[PDB]
Design a protein around this ligand. Structure first.
Ligand SMILES: Nc1ncnc2c1ncn2[C@@H]1O[C@H](COP(=O)(O)OP(=O)(O)OP(O)(O)=S)[C@@H](O)[C@H]1O
Ligand SMILES: CCOC(=O)/C(C#N)=C(\N)c1ccccc1
Ligand SMILES: [Mg+2]
Lengths: 125, 692
């Protein structure tokens, strides 16, 4: 709740426009965004509000957390994932084949087609 | 954009406001409207082009709120909930005859087949055979009535069985009592079942030569009603659809030949006419007709004539009398044979479909679609209409139970603040029909025929007495007729011939006839071993429909319901005529205002603590570590933790004694989507590749 209001203040009425929202989204890290924007028009045609912002963000929606995610993916449950099963999940959520080949190249020095993600987490930081 | 797409958003709530909304929308070709999760569908009687694969894909993966109201959204929601909570689903569809129950059922199947995917060959087999069932069953069980040109004359409950991948592995069709009487006669301007006109008009040369199949105008069963052609129905095209579908389902060319032999036998039996002999007995008029009918039945003409014209009477235990029938009695037995053939044929077709569609893999979940025959009223109403309207009354009762009663009772048990909304509970009407110990309509009919006297007239009189003796708010005895105050209105049932219709029992000599047959399919449709005990008084049609209906109720209460209320805007099948008063009557007796009021004041979503944790534990960092459940406390406190951690406002949710309630649909769709994007958000959490 705080995080939304502080990143809503940064980018001073409290009624904000769609372009400013696009900038907020970019700041965090396209068509779907405007789809989220377009589900309240009674209040104002080109602007929205902070309760509406909570609404549309939930309707969309540190070190340890990034650590966790690797354990989430690991079906073996042993610290080691298939590198091509990592490729696939970098493809599907999509967030460049060359970037995935470079990032898998860093971790591909293991050599067995598998990845120890604890070491690679520490490397990544 | 026309009026209000979800009646809970009406500015003023009344039946008249609802009627106005549906009428503006219908005039703007928006036949679909919501009451919360419930779908109302007004029959456009015109092809609007809203069931294209383009539209269909436009509904994939959406929730009720991201798209305009559509039957596809109800089906999407059913399939989503199936794979989400791993829960069986049932779709309930109400409507008067001609309101569009059957078309909505088919659009739901269409959506499920398209969305459910599956690339395996067996899977595509299932999907195509399921779809092929539609033309086959419609051709054998639908016919033109005054109220609807493609009128379901049988009830249906289709279950689709899915594997863990959410793919169609198998199907199962449960059929309710068919209107067999149609086979032998119709109201003027009504037709027989579609199949007879398809086959009479378009029979192959082979069939036309072996089986004698002439054009429908030559048969009494297909021409006496003075209707051979139907608006918007091409019989020869549809005959070809029938044949292809039979092939898809796996009928060999012999099986098909047997079926069409029986249909041709029926038509020929229908042309047998009688005159009165020197003793007043029945005598066949044209020997050639009976001869051909016997050929088709694979019996001798003497055997067919005897079976049609001689009644086996057992007055004492050890005495049997052969009593020759008079011409009227012989016509009665003729039609009894025709009806028995067609009914047993239909039952065989349904069993064979069930065999072809049986699960080839292990099955995980089911989706059921109910398509019953709708409430209907004619100038004359007999047992047929009583059975159909009884089923509609039971379905109304299910709707009331789920949509209005059960929810409010749950509010009261869960100490949620609630002022109960009043509604008319029609269980008394169901009681009036389906009651045994306090004799009801069906039971009274059975008791009248319990004596098993040769004469139906006396049984009808005994029944009329029983009816007079009953005192019940929804029953009104009259001179040889009785009115039932059904949920949907007054229906006047004619008492004449009603108890014989209820006592749906084949005569002894007619049953003796099938034994002599040379045809294997005839022996398939009429096994000899069930004729062992003549003395017994066998089950009645009302017994069978009572059993079917209460089976159905148990089934439906074992699955997660989705609701479709179809509305018939006019009795002329006009795309532009909107009969305000008729829609208003419908709105009223369906309790659409009550649904509106509950849905506005009600909570949108209710879930048990167990299943809620099981489904939404991933949302909380407390309750979830690395996609694995881990909670040290109670389930209730886990629910409270998950809700706090999602940071939805406290006003959007409420904690009961055993269950957890979420008020607004938007909140629920948000939680569901947050749940769906969990793996997406962990993968999103590994995306800090650009260091600076
Ligand atoms: N969604 C629809 N779009 C276009 N036409 C429709 C639609 N629904 C129904 N119709 C038309 O109305 C006719 C009746 O539709 P049905 O689905 O057969 O009604 P029904 O409720 O199943 O009737 P009963 O109760 O079985 S006699 C159809 O043949 C169509 O011509
Ligand atoms: C949809 C309800 O169909 C029926 O129940 C039905 C028919 N037709 C009969 N019980 C019946 C039996 C024998 C003779 C005439 C009628
Ligand atoms: Mg129908």
């Amino acid at each position: 709740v705080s995080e939304f209001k502080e990143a809503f203040s940064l980018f001073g009425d409290g009624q904000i426009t769609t372009k400013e929202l696009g900038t907020v989204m970019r700041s965090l890290g396209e068509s779907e965004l405007q789809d989220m924007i377009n589900e309240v028009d009674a209040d104002n045609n080109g602007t929205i509000d902070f309760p509406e912002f909570l609404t549309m963000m939930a309707r969309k929606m540190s070190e340890e957390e990034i650590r966790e995610a690797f354990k989430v993916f690991d079906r073996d449950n042993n610290g080691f994932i298939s590198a091509a099963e990592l490729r696939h999940v970098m493809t599907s959520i999509g967030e460049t084949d060359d970037e995935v080949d470079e990032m898998i190249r860093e971790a591909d020095q293991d050599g067995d087609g598998r990845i120890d993600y604890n070491e690679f987490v520490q490397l990544m930081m | 954009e026309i009026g209000v797409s979800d009646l809970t958003l009406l500015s003023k709530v009344s039946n008249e406001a609802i009627n106005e909304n549906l009428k503006k929308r219908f005039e703007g070709r928006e036949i679909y409207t919501y009451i919360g999760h419930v779908l109302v569908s007004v029959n456009p009687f015109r092809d609007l082009g809203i069931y294209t694969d383009d539209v269909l894909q436009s509904y994939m993966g959406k929730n009720r709120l991201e798209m305009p109201p559509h039957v596809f959204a109800i089906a999407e929601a059913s399939y989503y909930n199936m794979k989400a909570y791993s829960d069986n689903q049932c779709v309930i569809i109400s409507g008067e005859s001609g309101a569009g129950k059957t078309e909505a059922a088919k659009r739901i199947m269409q959506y499920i087949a398209s969305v459910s995917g599956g690339e395996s060959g067996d899977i595509k087999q299932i999907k195509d055979m399921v779809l092929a069932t539609n033309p086959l069953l419609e051709s054998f069980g639908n016919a033109k009535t005054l109220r609807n040109n493609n009128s379901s004359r049988f009830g249906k409950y289709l279950q689709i069985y899915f594997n863990t991948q959410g793919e169609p592995v198998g199907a199962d069709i449960t059929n309710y009592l068919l209107e067999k009487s149609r086979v032998v006669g119709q109201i003027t301007n009504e037709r027989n079942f579609h199949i007879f006109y398809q086959f009479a008009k378009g029979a192959s040369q082979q069939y036309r030569e072996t089986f004698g199949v002439q054009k429908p105008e030559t048969y009494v069963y297909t021409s006496r009603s003075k209707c051979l052609d139907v608006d918007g129905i091409d019989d020869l095209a549809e005959f070809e659809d029938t044949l292809n579908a039979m092939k898809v389902i796996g009928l060999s060319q012999p099986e098909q030949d047997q079926i069409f032999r029986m249909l041709s036998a029926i038509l020929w039996i229908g042309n047998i006419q009688f005159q009165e002999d020197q003793g007043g007995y029945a005598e066949v008029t044209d020997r050639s007709v009976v001869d051909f009918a016997a050929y088709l039945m694979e019996v001798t003409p003497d055997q067919l004539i005897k079976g049609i014209t001689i009644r086996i009477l057992t007055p004492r235990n050890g005495e049997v009398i052969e009593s020759p029938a008079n011409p009227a009695q012989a016509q009665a037995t003729r039609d009894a044979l025709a009806m028995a053939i067609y009914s047993n044929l239909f039952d065989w077709i349904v069993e064979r479909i069930n065999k072809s569609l049986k699960a080839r893999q292990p099955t995980t979940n089911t989706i059921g679609i109910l398509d019953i025959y709708g409430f209907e009223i004619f100038e004359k109403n007999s047992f047929e209409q009583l059975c159909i309207n009884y089923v509609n009354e039971k379905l109304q009762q299910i709707f009331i139970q789920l949509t209005l009663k059960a929810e409010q009772e749950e509010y009261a048990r869960e100490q949620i603040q609630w002022t109960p909304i009043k509604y008319f509970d029609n269980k008394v009407v169901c009681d009036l029909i389906e009651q045994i110990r306090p004799v009801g309509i069906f039971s009274a009919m059975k008791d009248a025929t319990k004596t098993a006297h040769a004469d139906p007239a006396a049984c009808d009189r005994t029944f009329m007495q029983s009816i007079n003796g009953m005192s019940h708010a929804h029953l009104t005895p009259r001179q040889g007729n009785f009115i039932i105050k059904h949920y949907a209105g007054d229906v006047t049932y004619t008492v004449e011939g009603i108890t014989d219709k209820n006592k749906d029992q084949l005569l002894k000599g007619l049953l003796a006839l099938f034994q002599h047959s040379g045809n294997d399919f005839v022996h398939t449709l009429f096994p000899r071993p069930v004729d062992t005990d003549n003395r017994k008084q066998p089950p009645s049609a009302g017994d069978r429909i009572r059993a079917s209906a209460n089976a159905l109720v148990d089934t439906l209460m074992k699955c997660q319901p989705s609701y479709i209320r179809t509305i018939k805007p006019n009795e002329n099948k006009s795309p532009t005529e909107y009969n305000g008063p008729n829609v208003l009557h419908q709105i009223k007796y369906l309790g659409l205002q009550e649904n509106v009021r509950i849905r506005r004041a009600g909570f949108a979503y209710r879930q048990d603590f167990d299943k809620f944790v099981d489904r939404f534990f991933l949302l909380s960092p407390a309750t979830s570590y690395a996609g694995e459940f881990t909670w040290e406390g109670t389930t209730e406190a886990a629910v409270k933790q998950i809700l706090k951690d999602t940071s939805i406002p406290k006003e959007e949710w409420q904690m009961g004694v055993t269950k957890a309630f979420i008020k607004a649909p938007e909140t629920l769709f948000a939680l569901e989507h947050m749940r769906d994007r969990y793996w997406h958000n962990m993968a999103t959490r590994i995306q800090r590749m650009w260091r600076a």
